[PDB]
Design a protein around this nucleic acid. Structure first.
Lengths: 155, 104, 628, 237, 138, 138
RNA sequence: GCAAAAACA
């Protein structure tokens, strides 16, 4: 049996910094203050008092989905939370993407079968994690935690 | 959300596609629109950032295409449970400095 | 991570609870389990010899191995027969009251267990429907098969079920009622077949794992041996079942002596055990206690069958030509598991030596414990499956090192092979971890693997509230939670409970109550909560009447026995409501008629089991007695 | 009273509608008591949101007292299904019942109320205490009933005539007669399938692990979740 | 929103709507008005307020704020009244039937908001004080 | 889909040559193109006769295209994107592929290829609106 | 695109 003076030193993976992969935005989350009212009133106010122009476009999310977003905003303002499909919804939700990929792969298939041999790309520590940690600390005017109190009978 | 003055706070909108879901772990198409504070290329490479103009004010709108399973959405609908562990640490510290001298 | 290690007023052991991925989605297993199952099968063959020779190991049958051959620098499967015999002897000599109570169990209440308890098991792969069925359905189908192909009625005891299995296994041809036929070799292969599936909601490791479930035919034998193992484990101080960690924490040692504390895990715990070692252990115990021979076969058959396991290899390996993907069974094309191609039997595969999770989690612990019992191991050991903690109480540091090394070697003797990287030894005792509990000086800290759901269970408002408050109470009792955490969790549960039952904001229920002047008088209706931290063990209706928050007229309205809709310590009321190619949905409804006539005629079954000899038409005896 | 043979009609229907399945032994009831063709879901709590929001959530027994439509709101599906707002409707415009059955139904739960409020507890003492979990009785019982004899006691208070003399000797005398004064209003078959749970709770002496800094009696063990902890203690009085 | 955009932006439609509501004449928007206001007892007070506002200001149908006030009063006036209840004074604001949307006489909040710079009906700027084309171009 | 061989009686009808990003009546196509390409040389009547949704879609589409195509090439690419250009072809009843882009593959006198495509058009909603108008007008 | 040793789309 051996003994160690050194605490283990963890290896730091090198490579591109890992991007933000989460369902929502987190630290970079703000809100638009709207006049008091229901959800429909606020959505109507936002849809009727705003114009959208693309600043940055990503190949992962084409800018044509803003049409889907505005259509949903207008439909919700008109009292219809669920709306019929539009053409821009084709490349917005991956409709028929499985069939597209399968048929393209069948058409372009070549070579011979081999093992799957999956791989996960290593990424380094992003600089924004510290920024995320220090920005979530910022004070706020509101309490943002409204939990109804329980009863009290004993000390 | 609503601030304690009645005003409505619009964090964003999430759009749910056809989502013909069968299995409890199956993904569901989503188109999430969010109000961003500062854009970053290397932090949000898959997001599309749009300029937003309400009442002569400046806002950034971010659109991303995601698919997210029902189990994960249910788990994150109970995200308020994350408060327990910091509350545990705080309560333990406070009660230690009440057990030291019988003074809460 | 530097924020998780305080240096003042609080020690890192208590804040180690922060090192838990709570409130996040649990990892979910995707795709085929074939690669994982094949790896699980191939690991024991790679560790039999110090030099890895897989092909030589596929024909070993009995996994007994000679000394100076156990891999001491790595994992080593198999066991040493002489070592197993000696350690079983040593374990039998000690813990005499446990052996006497095992004898009591095996003589008196062994031929007493009802065979119907196999219905409260796990998902079973039916050998007749060629698919997965719930355990009660599998049990009913199996007993119908036994009745049809054996012609002798099955007795209430499960010994009768085991005898029926043994007798029907000797027939050359069997036919089920439909009217499908089974050959003896086909039925034997089905008995050997193990249904493997992904293990879901498993937190704490990077790689997913697969568990295997046995066929219903062998499940009776598995249950009897597991029950014997549990009974003998409850009565041994070295087991992992009860306050053992706290008991060893409350120990005072010599003033100037070396007191070690080894906490570690087991690597490849189910990939290095052989059922033959368990056979030897059970036979030694039974032979030295003095049981008859039929008991020997009754306790040895399960491992005999498991030695010929036919675990299903999922759906097939994944092969990619270009961007295409395909599922291919083992042997169709070359891969890294080519050495097991010869053992492929249809969709299943044969592996003589090795284990699977979910089969014997108690007999493995027994084997580890009999390994613990020796002469120079003058320490305290607690074992629970693949996790253990050991306390060393000796006089010299080199004595402690020798004890730890011989502990590792004796664990390797039966093929336990504790992970070197997962085992940590502290020269002075006081800090350690076992199961999810953490030890620091005289305090032991229980940290949950999962937080309470803090959501309604999903049956009815009263039941959901009762179960949620009971779960919070259990969590606070085990020391996992305290005043602040308990109150915060019950507030969160209150919010979720009110939201799930249309008691928040504006909704159909709230509008209906508002327009009809219906005052919300309960928590699910929207009233202020009545439960507190101290009163969370009390029923809502019972607590509200004492405080005057529920008028007696309202109690009369809601607690009416003649109500349209009608541990759980909640009184029935109007809020106790139930939410609304198979070819099997008809027979569950006709079984409902059989269950409907009962519990209306017999108050007795609502008290004890249905212990009525015979009673096929014979139910008319009671009805005539009711008239008389 | 003229409905006794209706119970027999269940047998006659079972023989003609369910042949060769009800013909099995009565001992097999322990096997098919839980027989269901529905899969056991891993998370029933995930479906609660839809189920409440589902149209016609509650499958009620058919009845005529509850209006089909009340104040322009459809209530039943005309087993029939019910709207989600039928229970709270019953809380205000529901049927009446005798006062005696109200106490009997709520019995075994009230006793935990005044027994808690009557306790004075005491001043909170904070200290470096070390609770150790010992197995003690969970809830106080009216009588001390030996384990494995609880079902025998329940047999006498529900089916005294349908019993074996062997079970009579192995029954807790002095406690059987105490249950009949509280189970009498709910002794009828209308609410007897669930009354076993209430009756069992009176003399159930199950043992659970509770935090004990001092030897905990059942009087002080039912509320042990707040009496003592790692950092505080309560002197129960 | 559609009814208010119809009345506010055009003076003649506001005239006709107020006249029909005040005198109980048949109007194209009777069904909409009846479906917007809950069953109330403010009809007589609303009709009164109509009377004094018309008599005091014969030239009311040129200021959009006055048109908004008159439209609110007329919408309440043409509502479905209740028989077995005594009439009460018209409230400053009411809630739409089967909804949580507030309609306010002073138009300070809710469905209609009339700031000094502009008027917003249902979250949309119907009229701008200086930069707009409600009457169109030739 | 799967090929279904069988004798077929052709039905000769005009079908759209290629799908369009937006359907516009022929009278409004020149005004839509004028609004897309040269708004500075248009009048308010031309703007009023243009389909603004098609204008926005075409501007978004031809923002990168006009950098690599000459004026007339881009103009007529946009025109083709919003022009029906129906052509007569022999079709199969209850198997209209809504566009002759795939007739050679999905159809013949001996076979059809089964496909599952919905309308994804606002014609159903316009029917609903027209039906409401007709029902209330009667 | 989500997600990691392959499932959804």
């Amino acid at each position: 049996w051996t003994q160690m003076k050194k605490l283990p030193l963890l290896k730091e993976k090198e490579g591109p910094p890992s991007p933000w992969r989460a369902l929502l935005l987190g630290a970079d989350s703000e809100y638009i203050v709207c006049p008091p009212g229901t959800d429909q009133e606020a959505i109507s106010w936002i849809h009727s008092q705003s114009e959208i122009e693309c600043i940055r476009e990503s190949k992962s999310t084409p800018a044509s989905v803003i049409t889907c977003l505005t259509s949903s905003l207008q439909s919700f303002a008109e009292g219809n939370p669920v709306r019929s499909r539009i053409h821009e919804d084709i490349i917005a939700f991956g409709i028929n993407k499985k069939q597209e990929k399968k048929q393209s792969a069948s058409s372009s298939a070549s070579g011979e079968w081999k093992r799957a041999e999956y791989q996960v790309e290593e990424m380094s520590l992003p600089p924004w994690v510290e920024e995320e940690m220090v920005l979530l600390r910022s004070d706020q005017e509101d309490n943002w935690i409204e939990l109804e109190k329980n009863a009290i009978y004993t000390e | 959300t609503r601030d304690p003055s009645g005003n409505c706070q619009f964090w964003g909108m999430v759009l749910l596609g056809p989502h013909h879901v069968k299995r409890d772990t199956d993904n569901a198409p989503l188109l999430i629109a969010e109000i961003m504070g500062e854009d970053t290329e290397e932090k949000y490479p898959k997001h599309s950032v749009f300029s937003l103009k309400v009442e002569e004010k400046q806002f950034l709108l971010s659109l991303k295409i995601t698919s997210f399973s029902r189990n994960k959405l249910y788990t994150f609908s109970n995200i308020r449970r994350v408060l327990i562990q910091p509350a545990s640490i705080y309560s333990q510290v406070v009660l230690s400095r009440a057990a030291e001298n019988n003074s809460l | 991570m530097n924020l998780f290690t305080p240096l003042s007023e609080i020690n890192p052991t208590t804040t180690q609870e922060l090192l838990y991925a709570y409130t996040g989605p649990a990892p979910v297993a995707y795709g085929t389990r074939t690669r994982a199952v094949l790896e699980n099968i191939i690991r024991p063959y790679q560790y039999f010899y110090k030099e890895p020779n897989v092909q030589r190991a596929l024909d070993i049958k009995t996994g007994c191995k000679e000394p100076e051959d156990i891999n001491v620098e790595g994992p080593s499967s198999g066991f040493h027969t002489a070592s197993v015999l000696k350690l079983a002897d040593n374990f039998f000599r000690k813990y005499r009251p446990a052996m006497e109570k095992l004898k009591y169990w095996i003589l008196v209440k062994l031929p007493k267990l009802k065979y119907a308890e196999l219905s409260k098991g796990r998902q079973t792969y039916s050998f007749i429907h060629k698919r997965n069925l719930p355990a009660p359905i599998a049990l009913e189908e199996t007993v119908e098969f036994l009745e049809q192909n054996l012609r002798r009625k099955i007795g209430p005891t499960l010994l009768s079920y085991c005898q029926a299995i043994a007798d029907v296994m000797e027939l050359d041809e069997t036919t089920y009622e439909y009217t499908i036929k089974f050959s003896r070799e086909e039925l034997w292969d089905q008995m050997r077949t193990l249904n493997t599936m992904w293990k879901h909601l498993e937190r704490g490791r990077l790689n997913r794992r697969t568990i295997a479930t046995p066929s219903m035919l062998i499940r009776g034998f598995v249950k009897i041996v597991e029950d014997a193992a549990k009974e003998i484990l409850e009565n041994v101080p070295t087991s992992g079942v009860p306050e053992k960690l706290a008991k060893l924490a409350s120990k005072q040692t010599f003033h100037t002596a070396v007191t070690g504390e080894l906490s570690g895990d087991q690597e490849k715990f189910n990939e290095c055990l052989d059922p033959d070692a368990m056979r030897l252990m059970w036979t030694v115990f039974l032979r030295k206690l003095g049981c008859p021979d039929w008991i020997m076969e009754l306790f040895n058959i399960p491992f005999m069958v498991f030695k010929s396991k036919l675990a299903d290899m999922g759906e097939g390996l994944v092969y990619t030509k270009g961007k295409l993907t395909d599922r291919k069974p083992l042997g169709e094309m070359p891969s890294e598991f080519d050495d097991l191609v010869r053992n492929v039997v249809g969709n299943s595969i044969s592996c003589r030596l090795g284990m699977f999770m979910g089969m014997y989690n108690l007999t493995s612990t027994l084997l580890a414990l009999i390994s613990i019992e020796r002469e120079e191991l003058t320490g305290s050991h607690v074992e629970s499956s693949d996790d253990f903690i050991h306390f060393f109480n000796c006089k010299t540091h080199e004595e402690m090192f020798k004890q730890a090394e011989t502990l590792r070697l004796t664990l390797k003797l039966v093929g336990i092979n504790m992970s070197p990287s997962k085992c940590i030894l502290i020269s002075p005792a006081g800090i350690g971890e076992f199961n999810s509990k953490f030890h620091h000086r005289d305090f032991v800290g229980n940290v949950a693997t999962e937080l309470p759901a803090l959501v309604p269970n999903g049956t009815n408002p009263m039941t959901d509230l009762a179960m949620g408050l009971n779960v919070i109470k259990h969590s606070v009792n085990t020391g996992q939670m305290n005043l602040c955490t308990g109150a915060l969790a019950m507030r969160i549960f209150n919010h979720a409970y009110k939201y799930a039952y249309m008691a928040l904001g504006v909704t159909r229920r709230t509008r209906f109550m508002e327009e009809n002047a219906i005052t919300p008088l309960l928590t699910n209706q929207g009233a202020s909560p009545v439960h507190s931290f101290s009163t969370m063990h009390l029923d809502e209706v019972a607590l509200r009447r004492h405080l005057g928050l529920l008028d007696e007229e309202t109690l009369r309205r809601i607690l009416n026995p003649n109500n349209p809709v009608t541990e759980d310590y909640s009184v029935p009321s109007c809020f106790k409501y139930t939410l609304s190619h198979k070819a099997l949905l008809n027979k569950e409804e006709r079984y409902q008629r059989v269950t409907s006539i009962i519990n209306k005629l017999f108050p007795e079954v609502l008290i004890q089991e249905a212990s009525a000899p015979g009673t096929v038409e014979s139910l008319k005896r009671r009805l005539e007695l009711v008239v008389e | 009273e003229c409905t006794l043979r209706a119970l027999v009609e269940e047998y006659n229907g079972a023989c003609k509608e369910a042949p060769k399945e009800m013909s099995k032994q009565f001992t097999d009831y322990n096997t098919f008591k839980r027989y269901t063709t529905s899969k056991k879901d891993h998370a029933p709590q995930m479906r609660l949101v839809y189920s409440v929001r589902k149209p016609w959530p509650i499958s009620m027994t058919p009845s005529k007292e509850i209006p089909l439509v009340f104040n322009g709101t459809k209530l039943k599906d005309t087993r029939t299904r019910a709207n989600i707002v039928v229970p709270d409707y019953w809380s205000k415009y529901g049927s009446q019942t005798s006062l005696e059955v109200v106490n009997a139904i709520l019995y075994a739960e009230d006793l935990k109320v005044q027994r808690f409020f009557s306790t004075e507890w005491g001043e909170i003492r904070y200290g470096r205490m070390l609770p150790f979990r010992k197995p003690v009785q969970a809830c106080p019982t009216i009588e001390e009933v030996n384990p494995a004899s609880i079902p025998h006691t329940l047999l006498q208070v529900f089916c005294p005539q349908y019993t074996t003399l062997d079970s009579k000797r192995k029954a807790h005398m002095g406690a059987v007669e105490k249950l009949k004064r509280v189970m009498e209003p709910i002794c009828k078959v209308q609410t007897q399938e669930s009354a076993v749970h209430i009756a069992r709770s009176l003399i159930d002496s199950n043992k659970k692990w509770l935090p004990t800094v001092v030897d905990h009696t059942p009087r002080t063990a039912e509320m042990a979740h707040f009496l003592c902890s790692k950092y505080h203690y309560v002197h129960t009085n | 929103k559609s009814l208010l955009k119809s009345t506010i932006l055009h003076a003649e439609r506001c005239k006709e709507f107020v006249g029909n509501m005040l005198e109980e004449y048949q109007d194209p928007a009777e069904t909409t008005v009846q479906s917007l206001v809950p069953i109330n007892t403010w009809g007589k007070s609303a009709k009164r307020k109509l009377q004094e506002e018309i008599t005091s200001d014969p030239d009311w149908h040129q200021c959009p704020r006055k048109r908004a006030k008159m439209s609110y009063l007329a919408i309440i006036a043409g509502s479905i009244q209740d028989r077995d209840k005594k009439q009460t004074n018209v409230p400053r604001a009411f809630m739409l039937r089967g909804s949580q949307i507030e309609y306010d006489m002073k138009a300070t909040r809710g469905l209609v908001v009339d700031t000094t710079n502009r008027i917003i009906v249902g979250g949309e700027t119907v009229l701008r004080e200086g930069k707009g084309g409600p009457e169109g171009y030739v | 889909g799967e090929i279904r061989y069988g004798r077929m009686l052709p039905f000769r009808k005009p079908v759209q040559a290629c799908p369009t990003i937006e359907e516009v009546n022929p009278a409004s196509i020149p005004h839509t193109l004028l609004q897309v390409f040269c708004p500075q040389y248009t009048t308010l009547d031309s703007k009023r006769k243009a389909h603004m949704g098609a204008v926005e879609k075409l501007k978004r589409v031809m923002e990168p295209i006009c950098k690599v195509q000459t004026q007339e090439s881009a103009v007529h690419i946009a025109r083709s994107l919003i022009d029906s250009n129906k052509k007569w072809l022999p079709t199969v009843v209850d198997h209209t592929p809504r566009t002759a882009e795939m007739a050679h593959f999905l159809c013949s006198k001996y076979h059809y290829v089964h496909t599952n495509t919905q309308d994804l058009s606002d014609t159903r909603s316009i029917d609903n609106l027209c039906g409401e108008l007709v029902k209330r007008s009667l």
